């Protein structure tokens with residue numbers, strides 16, 4: 001009675017900070033608290049995957065001081081969240097052009113992956129330096145190279161093959177596509193998040209800002225989802 | 230205690246609108262009519278919306294007329310749907326042409342019945358010089374299948390040394406999608422409307438619609454009129 005894979009666009013961190021007379025960066029720290037709550041609660045509820053839109057390709061255009069702060073969050077606050085998620089049997093993974101992340105950020109995410117790699121509970125999947133069209137492009141580029149290198153023929157080119165070349169290929173086969181996509185902070189649009197995988201997803205929009213998105217809010221999103229069927 | 234006064238307010242009209250025309254069958258069944266009666270009523274709604282959007286300054290309307298999954302519906306229902314542009318051509322096309330509307334289609338349109346394809350081709354050829362709104366029918370269309378065929382064509386061009394794999398970019402992919410014949414700055418919908426209360430993605434323009442505004446209404450497609458389109462444009466204006 002729960003969606004197996006939930007995609008989340010965690011909007012409203014800056015707006016939340018602003019409403020509280022705090023610098024925008026504080027909102028992103030508060031967003032980590034909300035994700036911790038949602039990840040733990042979704043794991044208890046039976047959700048298999050959460051893919052979060054943690055950092056888009058367009059987020060690099062934000063002020064340098066803001067990007068640096070955001071990139072430092074898994075580095076500085078690793079001990080505050082990761083051991084607890086691991087104790088909760090949560091598996092941490094990432095998708096995106098993650099090689100372009102600062103050395104320390106990549107190291108912090110890799111350390112968290114390696115720690116939780118044997119965990120059998122919910123997969124918390126971070127979309128980092130991620131863009132949907134860029135993901136499809138790199139898949140379509142690789143398939144072309146494989147075709148040119150005779151590893152596959154052009155008759156092998158199918159929707160199923162494309163799915164195996166997307167960043168989501170490492171998720172179990174039946175769990176690659178989100179059943180539900182949640183978007184907070186009232187924006188009614190996808191912003192290049194999982195365009196291929198989310199082509200049939202149910203969509204849930206809330207005016208609730210991401211740092212305020214808790215267990216009760218996730219239970220509402222799940223309740224609405226089950227009412228769609 | 231209030232007074233009715235008109236105000237001059239600047240509103241941005243979306244250049245390209247995508248529409249998933251859901252609720253034809255629900256509309257007909259509600260009126261104790263067979264589902265097929267609803268699809269005929271859907272033609273009336275599209276005529277109203279197309280003419281009104283053309284006057285409003287909308288450049289493109291891409292409608293989800295027939296998906297790849299719609300072939301699974303009962304044979305007599307599919308046959309009736311396929312016959313609509315064949316039998317009712319004179320009822321809509323000359324009027325759209327008189328309104329300077331350009332008719333186009335996207336999808337695996339070679340798989341359409343001979344008569345259907347002929348009726349759509351006749352409408353394309355008639356309106357090909359028209360400079361107003363482009364009414365673009367997505368027929369035998371699936372988003373993932375569209376992306377797949379674009380790769381099938383791209384890999385073959387790499388193999389034939391027409392392009393190298395380093396030429397593979399987002400811009401190139403856009404030139405291989407079914408929407409390639411729309412002017413380059415108009416290929417992507419600015420707004421996607423979905424009627425009949427479903428809040429879901431249905432494999433409609435996944436690449437092109439990646440940044441679109443989304444508008445959902447409980448209004449059934451045959452009941453979607455000018456006032457309803459104006460509300461959707463109104464909603465689009467109040468976004469980020």
Ligand SMILES: Cc1onc(-c2ccccc2Cl)c1C(=O)Nc1ccc(C(C)C)cc1
Pocket residue numbers: 031032033035036054055070071072073074075077078079081082085092105108109112126128
């Ligand atoms: C909540 C939460 O639970 N665990 C993490 C985590 C995951 C991997 C490494 C370190 C941490 Cl703190 C985590 C979290 O919010 N991580 C996070 C925070 C910010 C970013 C930036 C790089 C966009 C990336 C990951």
Ligand SMILES: Cc1onc(-c2ccccc2Cl)c1C(=O)Nc1ccc(C(C)C)cc1
Pocket residue numbers: 271272273275276294295310311312313314315317318319321322325332345348349352366
């Ligand atoms: C409104 C409207 O205005 N003109 C058409 C039209 C467009 C092309 C050919 C013939 C017609 Cl009647 C039209 C319309 O509803 N066309 C239509 C209706 C149904 C179908 C089926 C095959 C899905 C395909 C096209």
